Ligand binder design. Structure first.
Ligand code: HEM
Ligand code: HEM
Lengths: 463, 463
């Protein structure tokens, strides 16, 4: 339980001294973000710690971050950390490694071009209209609104239609079989008891795989696998969704196997579902607690889109203050918290030796709130991202979507999705705090960047 | 227990149908060689089977064998099969993989040049004199001699002196601490209950490694590790052995770490100890049961080395009939039985697709006795290897030392070692069957190519 706990000592790298077997995981009692902030503050630009026996090297120099995420991505820093028993989802692009990831990224990148996105915009926009209709119910009864619920439904609606052409008002069909399955693809809490145990007993992962025990719910993955087979078999006899693009990609490296395709369909839900709804909720919390910013944003929207004109791909990209609001919220709440890459081979990068097998970690949350780069980092200040000020932002300090060849493949889609939701909602409503609104917002101490209590807000119709 | 058991069926490759969990391991009840001979006979040039869940593709075409062992060695077929919990012996050259093997092979190849070998010959020759002295005791009492005992002692003597400068008459110091340790580095029986269980439960290997349970005896490896540290620390203050060559290589890729060095010292014992003594025993069994061949060999020795002249590097390499006898015995008894390489990536080689992760196996024992290539393959016929006949021998059918960049690194040393022993012994003695000699020889049904009963022979002094 100590074998590798001498590594950073031998390399002269500072960090919290690890306990046998556990390493440093007891320092996670306040979650990832507080641990990373405290280590940054007390150890400086680089430090190392141990998740069980696994050494993790944290780096904060932007030039070093570029070398890892960009310059040496294919040669040395290709893969993320393996995390638990995964079964056939081994073929999902975010979990695949080395040449197999490189292949999958090539097969799937044409699916995320601006041209495919623009062709999807009318689809996503339809569910913004559904969102507004549902919000209007509660704006009329005066009941406070739980944001994760309404933005969760929106997120689900956009996924099911843009992924499979499945058109559902999920907020009002919460027991449609397709919705009750996809709702279960939530983000993993890596500080929960199962994942803590796997970190201390990583040698048990092969035992779980041989028993077909999978961190992705078996019932959900099998429902989706058989649903997809049915859509594929259909369709053929008699759409601009991700499934159709992937189906088309199967007829011209060696094509995308049928199982590989279902794995991507599932991982796209997992990657986009709770991420989008969380960020939307943080944004509306910031707008509700900064009425001046909400008004300025509604003024911009009304100017670009007079008389509640429906948003379009081009009109969205025109809105600079909208972009500034989205960007500043993601500075405060980079829901990934950390970026990680395994070091595949002994390397020396910009001054320091990094041994094979170390996980190199970029603490996005901590860098996003680092006073060296950000004046008053705890304040919500969209003007940081104005054309005036934004040139002073280092792209390797601000990394809410990662960076380089393995960054977020759905970044453009997620930005466009969230902005289209925000536009439609703000055209129709203003959001204000309740007495049940938690002000200021407290973050959870678990493994997910989420509010301590669900955000709840009053919705008032601008009509 | 069936996941991968459909692979050869899907590829249209024949082979014995596997049972759940076990695969084909129940067919090992007569050992590796009989299983490989029977499959070759009933399935043809290629077949597949499963060691538990691991698929193994057997190949017999010499052009395909060259492609695997030679042409695509670095790109695709670099590594042997992982086999059990190995601990720090992970750094031993025969167990290392990919770039780390390539590095170790580069660091260690200068240690096995003809020039280093010739410099070692006086050392090895000294223990041939010790062998003869010990044999003479039993040639005088008339007691039959157990070959593995006398050739085991010889093998040990040559190792301890050529590896560490440790000069011991091990047959008469059988409880010297250094001898009692090195005697334990015997070949693994992969059909024994532990290794059968590991084959059926390969998922338990990580559990064993985390508990520091190692297939190499811990007490032996630690005795040798501390012995080596003592020799290294000594020596320095105040030799042409492998240790000295490796020590010298540490002062000019990034040099050979201290632990890496001890790992090679241990693996060289493991690789050469029981291998050399087994082959010597097979050779003397063939000479004793073919007196005409033994006489012709003694006649050649007496002609090259009149009046029991001591053998030299150059005189050994002059003896053609000696070479033919050694080579034909190794045709009958290729103690490795099989050569193996893991397929690192999907490839198509000479006509057939081979998927990633399959073990490609070359059944040396079966090819060595294949009637297509060998007239009367069960007969001991040294004239096969005469300059007359030897051009008709395919170097990828006859592979007692493997082939290509990852062949036996100690091949020249082992040949020179065995020949020097045979020369000295045959200069002084003739070996004849006893009534306790098993004729014809029966092979064991376990996992090692060894006689069923120990070979025992009468030794008669030519004086
Ligand atoms: C606001 C919403 C989202 C945020 C903040 C976000 C953030 C991130 C981050 C930080 C990464 C890691 C990048 C790196 O390691 O350098 C990532 C990866 C990824 N995201 Fe997103 N993401 C979001 C939405 C989405 C959506 C909607 C999709 C799919 C439609 C998606 C698909 C992926 C995939 C596949 C990866 C792994 C890429 C690869 O391994 O090649 N994400 N995301
Ligand atoms: C008659 C005695 C010996 C026989 C029949 C023999 C046979 C073999 C065979 C068939 C291989 C596998 C080659 C392949 O996979 O293509 C091998 C590998 C090897 N042998 Fe030998 N061997 C003998 C003696 C020795 C000795 C004396 C040493 C060391 C001094 C040695 C060191 C090695 C090593 C290190 C490997 C692995 C090479 C690598 O992985 O790079 N062997 N041997």
């Amino acid at each position: 339980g100590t074998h590798s706990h001498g590594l950073f000592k031998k390399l002269g790298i500072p960090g919290p001294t690890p306990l046998p077997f556990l390493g440093n995981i007891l320092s996670y009692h306040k979650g990832f973000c507080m641990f990373d902030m405290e280590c940054h503050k007390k150890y400086g630009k680089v430090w190392g710690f141990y998740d069980g026996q696994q050494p993790v090297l944290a780096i904060t120099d932007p030039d070093m971050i570029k070398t890892v995420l960009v310059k040496e991505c294919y040669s040395v820093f290709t893969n993320r950390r393996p995390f638990g028993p995964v079964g056939f989802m081994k073929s999902a692009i975010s979990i695949a490694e080395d040449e197999e990831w490189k292949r999958l990224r090539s097969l799937l990148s044409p699916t995320f071009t601006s041209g495919k996105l623009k062709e999807m915009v009318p689809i996503i926009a339809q569910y913004g209209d559904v969102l507004v209709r549902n919000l209007r119910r509660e704006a009329e009864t005066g009941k406070p609104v739980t944001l994760k619920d309404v933005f969760g439904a929106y997120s689900m609606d956009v996924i099911t239609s843009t992924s499979f052409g499945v058109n559902i008002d999920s907020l009002n069909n919460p027991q449609d079989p397709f919705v009750e399955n996809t709702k279960k693809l939530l983000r993993f809490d890596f500080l929960d008891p199962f994942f803590l145990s796997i970190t201390v007993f990583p040698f048990l992962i092969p035992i779980l795989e041989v028993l077909n025990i999978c961190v992705f719910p078996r019932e959900v993955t099998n429902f989706l696998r058989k649903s997809v087979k049915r859509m594929k078999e259909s369709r053929l006899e008699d759409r601009v969704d991700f499934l159709q693009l992937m189906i088309d990609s199967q007829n011209s490296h060696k094509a995308l196997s049928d199982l590989e395709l279902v794995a991507q369909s599932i991982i796209f839900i997992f990657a986009g579902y709770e991420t989008t709804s969380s960020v939307l909720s943080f944004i509306m919390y910031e707008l509700a607690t900064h009425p001046d910013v909400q008004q300025k944003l509604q003024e911009e929207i009304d100017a670009v889109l007079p008389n509640k004109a429906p948003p379009t791909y081009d009109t969205v990209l025109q809105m600079e203050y909208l972009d500034m609001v989205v960007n500043e919220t993601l500075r405060l709440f980079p829901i990934a918290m950390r970026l990680e890459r395994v070091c595949k081979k002994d390397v020396e990068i910009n001054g320091m030796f990094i041994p094979k097998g170390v996980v190199v970690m970029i603490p996005s949350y901590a860098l996003h709130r680092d006073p060296k780069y950000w004046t008053e980092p705890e304040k919500f200040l969209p003007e940081r991202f104005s054309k005036k000020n934004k040139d002073n932002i280092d792209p390797y300090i601000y990394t809410p979507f990662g960076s380089g060849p393995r960054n977020c493949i759905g970044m453009r889609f997620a930005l466009m999705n969230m902005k289209l939701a925000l536009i439609r909602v703000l055209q129709n409503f203003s959001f204000k705090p309740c007495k049940e609104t938690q002000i200021p917002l407290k973050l959870s101490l678990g493994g997910l960047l989420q509010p301590e209590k669900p955000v709840v807000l009053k919705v008032e119709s601008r009509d």
